[PDB]
C-alpha cells in the first residue's frame, strides 16, 4: 500500500492499511457466528433426506414461502409514510454493498 | 448438473424442492432452479465454507464505478480529459444520457422482448438492469457524475481528465453516504435503533472491521418485503402515463427495452416518488409477483424470491432465529407461546413452529421480516441489530468516510449537507417538480411536492483550486 | 451428529451441536482480530526487502531477541514461589490445546 | 530444498534473517531455519491466509489420547478387554510402564546420542520427546489411564475394553481440566484476573465458541520465559542424582535415551517438584540454552526460541502490541514515555522503540513478556487477558466439561475433587514424598514436603454400576 494516496482505489483495496483486503473487493464475507451445515463445514440443511437440524425435520423454502409469506394481492397495504423510492434506494444501496458470485 | 435446466441435486446445485398441493408447481418432479454461490475455499476438507463479496464493501458508490480496475476502465469515457463516464452511443433519453449497453453471451434483457432486442445495461454492478426502477437509479447517478465533472471543469482549467473523474466520483460516493444515513437509514431502523446502533459520528476508527457480514447479505433483503406488484409511471402532471401506466413486476424484471422505448427514465422516477412503498405487515409479507413469477420471462420456471431468500441462507451455513437473537443480545423464544409474544402475533408463532418445530430453525430473513415493526421504522429488533451493527461498520472503519477529518474542507462538508436526492433529480431529468424531503416519507402527489426552483443545487465553489 | 454421547469423540467433532467441527482437530484457527499480511492476504512482515510496517522497518526477530531477551545467564532469578513443574504444566497442556502443522 | 539445510526464502520457507555483527552466526547470509505454518486454504488468491490447529482445543487429555481416529487406535493395547493404552515392549522404568517407541522417518531422537539407538515416543502428542520432562508428564498420565482402567475393571467385572478405556479416559480428561483450572492458572493470572476472566462457572454455554485463537498459539509462549538451562534429577532423598544431576537443556531435547538408560522418570519428576522455575524478568527475559542452542544436536545450527516466536507471530499475521491492547481494552502507548509507563520500565521502552520504532509494531510475544506482572502471577495485563479469555471459552464451551450437569454425577464429582498431581505421582512412580499443593508453588525440599501415604487415594466407589 502506497505511503500517502488522494482518493479510493476501485477494489477497496489499501483503505485499511494494517490489513489493507478488508471491504476489498472478491474476498471472503466476515463471519459474526459460526457456521452452521448439515455436515459441519459444507453441506446446506435440507441437502441430504431424513437429516433434521438441531432436533426437527428441515423445512422446504417453498414450503414455508406458500404457507407464511403467500398472501391475497387484493389485502396489499400501501405504506403511508414511505415511497416506493424508499424500496429502490435499497436495492440500490444493497448493490454498492454485496454481490455473492455463483457459478454460471 | 445443469442447475438452470435439471432438478437433480448435485454441486454446484441446490434446486429447491416442491412440496404437496403446491399452489402453482403441480409436478412435485420440477424444481424452483438454485445455484450454490461459490466457496472462498473450492474443494476443501479443512475450511469451513464461505461465500465471496465480489464488491467493495463501503459505501462509495461501486454500482457506478465498478470494484475492479479493467470494469472501472471500461466504464470510463477514454475518448477525452473531461473525466465522464462512457455513455449509450446508440440511445438517449429525450438528449439525455443512457447506460452504455453490455456484451452478454447469454442477455436476459434480450428474452424480455424479442422484438424490440434492447440488451441489458452495462454498469459498475452486474444487476443495472434487474428492473427499470433500478436502472433509472444507476442511470440518474451516472448523468450526476457527468454534471458534476463538467461544473469542476469549469471552475478548474488545469485538472486533466483523471482528476475531474476522481474529485467527481468522490462527490457522488459522499452523496450517496449522505442520502444513506442521513434520509434513509433513520426511516429502516426508527429513532430508537438509530440512536443505539448508529451514535454521532466521531473519526476513522482503523480497528472497525468494515467488511459486509455473511448474515447481513441475507437480513438486508427485508427490503424484498417493500416491493410493490407494479412498476408504476407517471406523466409531467403526475397522472399516469398511457398506454401502460402499470407493468406488473414479472413483466419489468430485465426489461431494459422499456427505458430506451418506452419514455426513458422521467416516468419512472415519478413513479417512484409519488406511489406508496408496499407495508409489511405479518400476514402480508411478500407479493406473488417476486413469490410466483420472479424472472418467468427470462427463464424455464417462475421463481420465488422468498423462498430462494432461505434456501440461500441454508447455502451460507447461517445460524436460524434464535442465534441471531442470542448475538443481537436479544431474547430467545423457546415456546410457541413465547415466539408469540416476542411476535406480538400467536397466529404467527404457529404458523412458524408448524414450519420450523423450533424458533432455533426458523431462517435468518424469514424470523427477521416476521418481527413487529419498531416505531418509525419498517424493520423489527433483529434486522435492526444486524443492520444497524453493519452500517456503522462501513461507516466508522472507513477511511474515507465524508466526514472524516481530511477527506473534505469544512467548507466542502457544509456544501455536501445541501445535497439530497431531490435535487439530483431535478438536476439530471426532465422532471421540474419533485418530493419535499424527506424523499423516503413523502409519497402523495401534490401534498409532498415542490417545485425544483425552491432547491439549491450543490455550491461547488469550495472546490475551486486557485 | 448422534442424539446422546456419553464420551468425546477423539476428533472433538460434535461436541459442538449446531457447530461439530467446534474445537476438533485439524481446522483452522479462529482469528480474533484481521490479519497483518505484507501484501494483504498471506506474505509475512519482513518476506520483501524495502517493505516497511505502518512507517518503520521489519525487526529482524534475531536482532530483537539479541538486544531485548539475551541476558547473562548467571543472573538467573529463581521464582521462590514456583517450581519447575509449573513451567512444564504449561507446556504439557499447550499439548493438549494447540498444535500448529508445518510442511516436512 | 529444505528449510533445514539452506537459507533460500522460498516456500514453504521464511528462514530468519541474521543481523549485522551476531555474536553467534556470523555470516550475515546465513540463517535461522523456519518453515511457514501449512495455510488453512493452500494457494488461495481470495482467501486471508489461516494456519492449522492438529489438536482437539478442548482440555480433554489429547496429547495422551490423540485427536486422530487411527492414531488413537494406535496408542491402545488392543489385544485384550482391558482398556489399556500400549506399553513400551522393549524396556520399562523399574517394573513401570515407559511408553512406546514411535516410528519416524527422520527421527530426531536418535540424533541425540547416536550409539544408544533409542528412537522417540509415540503419544496422543507429536512433541512427547521434545524435552525429557515433558515424555515423563506424558509417561506419568499414561501409567494413571492404565491403573485407572484396571481399577475400574475390578470393580465393574463385566465392563468390556471398550467401556474401561472410555471411563479412565474420561477420568484422566477430569483431571487435567481441574488441575489446570484449581491449580494452574489461578498461578499464571493472579487472584484479579482470574476472578475478570474466569467467573465461577454457571453451566455449558452452547454459543460460547471453542476454537483456539490464533493467537493464543503465539500468546501462550509465555510459558519460554519460564524455562531454566537445565534438566534436574534427583535421588530418592531429592539429592542431585550422581554422575549428571544438571545436564544442559541443549542436551536433553529429543534426548529419550535418557528416560530409557538413565534412570527413567522418577529422578526427572522429583526435579520439577523441588526445583524452582526461573522467574520472567524485564532484564531476564529467556535463557540462552533455548535463545542460542535450542536443537543444537539435531539440526545444522542452535536455534533461537524467542526470535522462533516472533517470526512465527509474523508468519501467522498477527497484530502488533497496540492492536492487541486495543482488543483487551487496555490504552495503547503512542510514544516512549507512555509506553514507560504501562512497562513501568522507561528502559525497557527504549530498548522496544529502537527496535521496533512504533508500540504498534511490537510482536505479540515479546510486548506480551515484557509487561510488568500481575500480583501472584506470571504474566501482565494483556497475556493475563488473551490466556484468560482462551480459558473461559474452554470451559464455558465445552460440552463435556466435567462439572457440566450429566457428565459426572454429584458422587462422582465430589470424588474427582479430591484428586491431585503429587497424588497421581504417588500413584505411578516410586516417589513416596511429594510436594504439598499447591505443587505449582511448592519447590524446597523438605519444607515444600510431604509423604505420599498422608494422601488419600481417589475413590472410585462411584464408578461402580449398581
Ligand atoms: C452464552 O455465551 C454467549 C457468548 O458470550 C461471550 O463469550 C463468553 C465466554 C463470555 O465471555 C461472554 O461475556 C461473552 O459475551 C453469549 O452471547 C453473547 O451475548 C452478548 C450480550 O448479549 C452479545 O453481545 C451483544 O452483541 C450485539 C451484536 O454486536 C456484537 O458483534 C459485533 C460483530 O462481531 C461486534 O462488532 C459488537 O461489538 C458486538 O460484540 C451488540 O449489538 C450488543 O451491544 C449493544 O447492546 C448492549 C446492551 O444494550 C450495549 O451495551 C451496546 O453498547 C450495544 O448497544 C452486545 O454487545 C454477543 O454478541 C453474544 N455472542 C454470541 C456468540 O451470541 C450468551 O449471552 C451466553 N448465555 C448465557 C446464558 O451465558
Ligand atoms: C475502535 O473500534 C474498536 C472496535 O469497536 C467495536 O466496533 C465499533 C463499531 C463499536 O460498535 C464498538 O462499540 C465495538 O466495540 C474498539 O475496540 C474494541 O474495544 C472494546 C472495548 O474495549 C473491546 O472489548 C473488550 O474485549 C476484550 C476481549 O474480549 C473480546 O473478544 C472476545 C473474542 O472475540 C469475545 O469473546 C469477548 O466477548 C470480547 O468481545 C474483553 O476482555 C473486554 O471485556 C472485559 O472487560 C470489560 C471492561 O472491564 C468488562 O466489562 C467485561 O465484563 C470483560 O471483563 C471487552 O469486551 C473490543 O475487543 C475491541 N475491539 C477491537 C477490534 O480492538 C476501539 O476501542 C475503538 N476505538 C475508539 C477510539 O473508538
Ligand atoms: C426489483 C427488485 C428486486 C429484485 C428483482 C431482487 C431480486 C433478488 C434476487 C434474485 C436475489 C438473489 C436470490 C437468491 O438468493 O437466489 C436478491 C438478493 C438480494 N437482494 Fe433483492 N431484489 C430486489 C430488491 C431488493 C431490495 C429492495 C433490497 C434491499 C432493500 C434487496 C436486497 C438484496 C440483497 C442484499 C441481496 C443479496 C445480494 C448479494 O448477492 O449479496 N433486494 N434479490
Ligand atoms: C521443554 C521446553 C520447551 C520447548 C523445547 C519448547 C519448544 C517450542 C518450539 C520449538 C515451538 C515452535 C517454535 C516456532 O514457532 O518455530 C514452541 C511452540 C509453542 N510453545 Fe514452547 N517449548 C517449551 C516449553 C513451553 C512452555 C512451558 C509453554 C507454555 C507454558 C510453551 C508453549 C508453546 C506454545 C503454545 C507453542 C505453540 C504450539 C503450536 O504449535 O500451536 N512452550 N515451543
Ligand atoms: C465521450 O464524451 C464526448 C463529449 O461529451 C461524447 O461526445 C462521446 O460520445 C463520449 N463517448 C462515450 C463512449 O461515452
Ligand atoms: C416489444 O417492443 C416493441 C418495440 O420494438 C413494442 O412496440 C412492443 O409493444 C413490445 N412488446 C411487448 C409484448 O410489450
Ligand atoms: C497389553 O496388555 C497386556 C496385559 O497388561 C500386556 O502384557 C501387554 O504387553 C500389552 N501390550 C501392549 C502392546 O501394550
Ligand atoms: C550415550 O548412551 C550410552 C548408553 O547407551 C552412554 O553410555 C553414553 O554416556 C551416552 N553418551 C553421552 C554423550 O552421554
Ligand atoms: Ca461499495
Ligand atoms: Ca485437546
Redo the contacts between chains.
Keep these: 500500500c502506497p505511503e500517502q494516496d488522494k482518493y479510493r482505489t476501485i477494489t477497496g483495496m489499501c483503505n485499511n492499511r494494517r490489513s489493507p483486503t478488508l471491504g476489498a473487493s472478491n474476498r471472503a464475507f466476515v463471519r459474526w457466528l459460526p457456521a452452521e451445515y448439515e455436515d459441519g463445514f459444507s453441506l446446506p440443511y435440507g441437502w441430504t433426506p431424513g437429516v433434521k437440524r438441531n432436533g426437527f425435520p428441515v423445512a422446504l423454502a417453498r414450503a414455508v414461502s406458500n404457507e407464511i409469506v403467500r398472501f391475497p394481492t387484493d389485502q396489499l397495504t400501501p405504506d403511508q409514510e414511505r415511497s416506493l423510492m424508499f424500496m429502490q434506494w435499497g436495492q440500490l444501496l444493497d448493490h454498492d454493498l454485496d454481490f455473492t458470485p455463483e457459478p454460471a | 448438473v445443469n442447475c438452470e435446466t435439471s432438478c437433480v ?1 448435485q454441486p ?1 446445485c ?1 434446486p ?4 404437496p398441493n ?2 402453482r408447481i403441480k409436478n412435485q418432479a420440477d424444481c ?1 432452479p438454485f ?7 473450492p474443494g ?20 457506478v ?5 479493467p470494469l ?1 476502465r471500461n466504464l470510463r469515457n477514454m475518448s477525452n480529459q473531461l473525466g465522464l463516464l462512457a455513455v449509450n452511443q446508440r440511445f438517449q433519453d429525450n438528449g439525455r444520457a443512457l447506460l452504455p449497453f453490455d456484451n452478454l453471451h447469454d442477455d436476459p434483457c434480450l428474452l424480455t422482448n424479442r422484438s424490440a432486442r434492447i440488451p441489458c445495461f452495462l454498469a459498475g ?4 438492469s ?2 427499470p ?2 436502472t433509472s ?2 442511470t440518474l447517478l451516472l448523468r450526476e457524475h457527468n454534471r458534476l465533472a463538467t461544473e469542476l471543469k469549469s471552475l478548474n482549467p488545469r485538472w486533466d481528465g483523471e482528476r475531474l473523474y ?1 474529485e467527481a ?2 462527490i457522488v ?1 459522499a452523496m ?1 453516504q449522505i ?2 444515513y442521513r434520509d ?1 437509514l433513520p ?2 431502523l426508527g429513532p430508537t435503533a438509530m440512536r443505539k446502533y448508529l451514535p454521532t459520528y466521531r473519526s476513522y476508527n ?2 472497525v ?9 441475507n437480513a ?2 427485508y ?1 424484498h418485503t ?4 407494479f412498476m ?1 409511471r407517471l406523466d409531467n402532471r403526475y397522472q399516469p402515463m398511457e398506454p401502460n401506466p402499470r407493468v406488473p413486476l414479472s413483466r419489468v424484471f430485465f426489461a431494459s427495452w422499456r427505458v430506451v422505448l418506452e419514455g426513458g427514465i422521467d416516468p419512472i422516477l415519478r ?9 409489511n ?1 405479518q ?6 409477483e417476486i ?1 410466483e413469477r420472479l424472472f418467468e420471462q427470462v427463464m424455464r420456471i417462475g421463481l ?1 424470491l ?7 441462507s ?7 432465529y434464535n ?2 437473537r ?2 443481537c443480545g436479544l431474547p430467545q423464544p423457546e415456546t410457541v407461546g413465547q415466539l408469540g409474544t416476542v411476535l406480538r402475533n400467536l397466529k ?1 408463532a404457529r ?2 413452529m ?5 424458533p ?2 426458523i ?1 435468518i430473513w ?1 424470523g427477521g421480516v ?1 418481527e413487529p415493526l419498531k416505531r418509525k421504522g ?1 424493520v423489527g429488533p433483529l434486522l435492526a441489530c444486524i443492520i444497524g451493527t453493519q452500517f456503522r461498520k ?1 461507516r466508522d ?4 468516510w465524508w466526514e472524516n477529518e481530511g477527506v473534505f474542507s469544512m467548507q466542502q462538508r457544509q456544501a455536501l449537507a445541501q445535497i439530497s ?1 431531490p435535487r439530483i433529480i431535478c438536476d439530471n431529468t426532465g422532471i421540474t417538480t419533485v ?1 419535499k424531503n424527506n ?5 402523495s402527489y401534490p401534498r409532498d411536492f415542490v417545485n425544483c426552483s425552491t432547491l439549491p443545487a450543490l455550491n461547488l465553489a469550495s472546490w475551486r483550486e486557485a
Design positions: 441435486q454446484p441446490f429447491l424442492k416442491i412440496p403446491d399452489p424452483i445455484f450454490r454461490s461459490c466457496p472462498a475455499c476443501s476438507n479443512i475450511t469451513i465454507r464461505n461465500q465471496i463479496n465480489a464488491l467493495t464493501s463501503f459505501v462509495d458508490a461501486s454500482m464505478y465498478g470494484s475492479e480496475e472501472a454492478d452486474t444487476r443495472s434487474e428492473m426502477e433500478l437509479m444507476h476522481q466520483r468522490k460516493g450517496v442520502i444513506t434513509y426511516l429502516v482503523d480497528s472491521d468494515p467488511r459486509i457480514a455473511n448474515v447481513f447479505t438486508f433483503r427490503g417493500l416491493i410493490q406488484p408504476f413513479g417512484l416518488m409519488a406511489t406508496p412503498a408496499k407495508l405487515r400476514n402480508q409479507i411478500a407479493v406473488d413469490r420465488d422468498p423462498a430462494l431468500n432461505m434456501q440461500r441454508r447455502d451460507h451455513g447461517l445460524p436460524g442465534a441471531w442470542r448475538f404467527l404458523k412458524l408448524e414450519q420450523y418445530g423450533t432455533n430453525n431462517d424469514m416476521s419498517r462501513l472503519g472507513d477511511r474515507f436526492l418530493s424523499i423516503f416519507m413523502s409519497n
